[PDB]
Design a protein around this ligand. Structure first.
Ligand SMILES: OC[C@H]1O[C@@H](O[C@@H]2[C@@H](O)[C@H](O[C@@H]3[C@@H](O)[C@H](O)O[C@H](CO)[C@H]3O)O[C@H](CO)[C@H]2O)[C@H](O)[C@@H](O)[C@@H]1O
Ligand SMILES: OC[C@H]1O[C@@H](O[C@@H]2[C@@H](O)[C@H](O[C@@H]3[C@@H](O)[C@H](O)O[C@H](CO)[C@H]3O)O[C@H](CO)[C@H]2O)[C@H](O)[C@@H](O)[C@@H]1O
Length: 549
């Protein structure tokens, strides 16, 4: 039984420098996906190596676009790969669930616009011009994530609240609103927080670039980049990154029809997983318990666990690479949605860690969804490089009970690294860290907006549950460039005692923390523990702590 390789299904639209009506055939997708925030259509747009002209690819919901060279410059657009905000009058605060990878862009007026909020990665791009992250106007925006990219000109966030860039090069960088964090960025502005609120690290401590599909002349393969310790700048500027290249014959090609049983029997049998674009329902976890297994998603491939099961269980193995998957809770509460490693997991994976990359969790919004904890990271050395774990605040099936989700991410492994951590709206602790020697570079949280009252969120004798808690038994932890925002629109008399909670210990340190009330809808009492000013006013002024402790 199981069979690697084959055609990639209807939802992977694959273009070359000759193909007909590329513009009309990219277009059509956009007019279908532009306002389709909670529909089940999914699309991947893939471009063969060469040069494309006259192209302006507006990217809507649940649309990935990428090149199929090894290097960004192998697939060049004279034109744009664009996100803006027309559907929502210029408000970019719901521009979610889309992606761009492995392309070079020569934008038509000199500037590519990528007006995105969360879960909208921009990886391995070469922009031969500037990159604007704001919508036409300077309406609300809440991004964002760039990795492994070279922007020849200026990145211009304008009204973007916050941003994370790693292992990249920019010609310059125009402005900082609340929290612009950089690690391993050539051309980043020097560290300057509080004002302007730039958090700048010379290197990312460990990174490994996300695997991606690409052509060898005409063989579908997947490139699996070689890990980089103390990374700075791009992996591909000096051509060939170290890395090995699985052929697609060694992947099971997931489509509708596939069962959890079938997907499991493939990883078992010795195949990797390529999820083609679609929404998949499963009645038991997808379990990845072979070392070095790549599970790569296309087109915002989405897994929904039925019957309260865990969607994804990774075993206690080295080297697994989960990349490009949206895990969408079912109506029936799952105790966990994603578990990396087993409970009581104990060995190390330093040389060849497991990673989650562009893994997105949603609880609610397309109908009710519920989970107790969304991601449990048990495995030591795991890298979490871009995640958005989101209890819905809008849509259908949202409400304090209707889409209850108490806990977002629980990190129990030791030496876990999060780079680009976005977690929002959980009824209790958005992030909890119980393991040793953890490190987070960039955090973005917003609290739950629908606590019906203060009693709903009493946390023992603390008011509210921290956005980011380090259990007081930890000895060793560090974070950089971290923010928590509140919008208790339902009951704006609520108080949130702090954004962050931790031990007061020599080795449990932070850098550049902030909390923000959005329009005076509730307030924070402090930034971390009992330290830092409360928020005040209705004018959305951040309260900050530069150091801790
Ligand atoms: O021609 C190059 C030029 O393309 C620009 O893309 C624009 C879109 O910004 C725009 O999308 C509109 C909304 O953002 C706007 O506010 O209102 C309506 C309603 O939805 C939208 O059309 O639409 C036109 C065409 O549809 C696009 O060309 C890029 O932003 C820009 O960077 C680029 O230079
Ligand atoms: O609800 C949609 C979406 O909202 C996101 O949070 C937004 C905030 O992004 C937004 O913040 C505004 C700032 O961008 C702007 O600069 O300042 C004004 C104040 O003058 C801010 O309000 O505020 C809205 C609420 O009005 C928030 O909901 C969430 O991150 C996201 O999860 C959510 O889906």
């Amino acid at each position: 039984e199981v069979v690697g390789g084959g055609d990639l299904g209807p939802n992977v639209l694959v273009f070359d420098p000759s193909t007909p009506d590329i513009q009309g055939k990219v277009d059509e997708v956009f007019r279908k996906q532009e306002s389709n925030q909670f529909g089940t259509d999914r699309y991947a747009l893939m471009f063969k190596p060469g040069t494309y002209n006259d192209i302006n690819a507006q990217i809507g919901f649940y649309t990935s676009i990428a090149g199929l060279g090894l290097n960004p410059d192998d697939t060049t657009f004279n034109g744009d790969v664009t996100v803006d905000a027309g559907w929502f009058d210029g408000n970019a605060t719901q521009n979610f669930w889309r992606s761009a990878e492995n392309l070079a862009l020569n934008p038509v007026n000199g500037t590519n616009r990528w007006a995105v909020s969360q879960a909208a990665p921009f990886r391995r791009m070469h922009v031969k011009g500037g990159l604007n992250l704001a919508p036409d106007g300077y309406g609300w925006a809440s991004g964002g994530y760039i990795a492994d990219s070279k922007i020849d000109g200026e990145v211009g966030p304008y009204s973007q609240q916050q941003w994370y860039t790693r292992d990249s090069s920019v010609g310059g960088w125009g402005n900082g609103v609340w929290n612009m964090t950089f690690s391993g960025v050539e051309g980043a502005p020097a560290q300057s927080f509080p004002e302007p609120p730039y958090t700048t690290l010379e290197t990312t401590p460990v990174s490994r670039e996300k695997p991606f599909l690409y052509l060898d002349g005409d063989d579908y393969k997947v490139f699996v980049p070689a890990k980089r310790t103390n990374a700075r700048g791009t992996s591909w500027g000096n051509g060939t990154p170290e890395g090995e290249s699985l052929p697609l014959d060694q992947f099971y090609v997931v489509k509708p029809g596939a069962t959890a049983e079938t997907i499991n029997a493939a990883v078992d049998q010795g195949l990797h997983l390529l999820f083609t674009p679609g929404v998949y329902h499963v009645d038991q976890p997808i379990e990845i318990d072979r070392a070095n297994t790549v599970a790569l998603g296309l087109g915002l491939a989405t897994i929904i666990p039925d019957n309260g099961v865990t969607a994804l269980k990774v075993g206690d193995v080295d080297g697994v690479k989960v990349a490009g998957l949206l895990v969408d809770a079912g109506p029936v509460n799952s105790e966990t949605l994603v578990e990396v490693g087993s409970d009581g997991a104990s060995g190390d994976h330093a040389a060849n860690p497991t990673s989650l990359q562009d893994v997105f969790v949603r609880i609610g919004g397309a109908g009710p969804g519920k989970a107790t904890t969304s991601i449990v990271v048990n495995s030591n050395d795991t890298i979490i490089d871009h995640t958005w774990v989101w209890r819905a605040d809008h849509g259908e099936g949202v409400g304090w009970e209707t889409n209850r989700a108490d806990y977002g991410v629980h990190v129990k492994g030791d030496n876990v690294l999060a780079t680009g951590l976005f977690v929002e709206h959980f009824n209790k602790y958005d992030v909890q860290w119980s393991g040793e020697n953890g490190k987070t570079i960039f955090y973005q949280n917003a609290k739950a907006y629908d606590a019906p009252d203060q009693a709903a969120i009493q946390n023992g004798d603390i008011k509210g549950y921290a956005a980011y808690k380090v259990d007081d038994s930890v000895t060793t932890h560090e974070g950089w460039g971290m923010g928590s925002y509140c919008y208790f629109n339902v009951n704006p008399d609520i108080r949130q005692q702090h954004g962050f909670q931790a031990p007061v210990k020599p080795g449990v340190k932070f850098h550049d923390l902030l909390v923000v009330s959005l329009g005076g809808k509730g307030q924070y009492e402090h930034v971390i523990n009992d330290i830092g000013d409360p928020t005040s006013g209705d004018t959305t002024i951040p309260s900050q702590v530069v150091s801790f402790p």
